[PDB]
């Protein structure tokens, strides 16, 4: 059936919440890599070796 | 309920007996208006002296330091001190009265 303006606005809010959640997850992943920075540097040096 | 503290420092002209702190307090009491009307301070705005030629203001409304500077300049113009005293913001919410730059002739 034909959806209403409230349903369309709810879908738009869902999309905005999804984008914000993805951005927050990306920031947390970057923070976790910053936590495990030394292991990453050792792995990169081993790969170059 | 939020509060804001404002300081009007006039220590140098007050010690020089040029600026009258009590007269300035009376002028502020009779001129600061709340909701577009003077004589409507109540518990919203409190004006006191903390000594050393300073006037201290508690405001619970959105009273602005630009309005306080405007009233200070009005008082200086009434006291014929506008051409010789200057109101300068020195900190967040602190306005100091001081002499303009003087050249020795």
């Amino acid at each position: 059936r034909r959806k209403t303006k409230a349903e369309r606005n709810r879908i738009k809010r869902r999309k905005e919440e999804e984008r914000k959640r993805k951005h927050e997850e990306a920031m947390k992943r970057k923070q976790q890599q910053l936590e495990q920075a030394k292991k990453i540097a050792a792995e990169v040096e081993e790969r170059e070796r | 309920k939020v509060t804001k503290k404002f300081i009007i420092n006039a220590s140098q002209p007050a010690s020089d007996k040029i600026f009258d702190v009590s007269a300035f307090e009376k002028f502020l009491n009779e001129r600061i208006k709340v909701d577009g009307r003077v004589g409507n301070l109540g518990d919203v705005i409190k004006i006191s002296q903390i000594g050393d030629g300073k006037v201290e203001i508690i405001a619970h409304n959105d009273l602005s330091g630009r309005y306080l500077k405007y009233l200070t300049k009005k008082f200086l113009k009434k006291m014929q001190l506008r051409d010789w005293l200057r109101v300068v913001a020195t900190s967040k919410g602190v306005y100091e009265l001081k002499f303009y730059n003087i050249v020795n002739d």
Partner: protein, 43 residues
């Protein structure tokens, strides 16, 4: 005031003469010798 044609130069950009400040405060009734405006005046 000539605000129709030009703006007034700000007071902070003009150095006030010591003699004129002396005269104005003296008519206002301030004993300037007790406060020492001579030391406050720059050169």
């Amino acid at each position: 005031k000539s605000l129709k044609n030009r703006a007034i130069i700000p007071r902070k950009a003009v150095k006030k003469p010591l003699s004129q400040l002396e005269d104005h405060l003296d008519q206002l009734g301030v004993d300037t010798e007790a406060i020492g405006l001579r030391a406050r005046a720059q050169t």
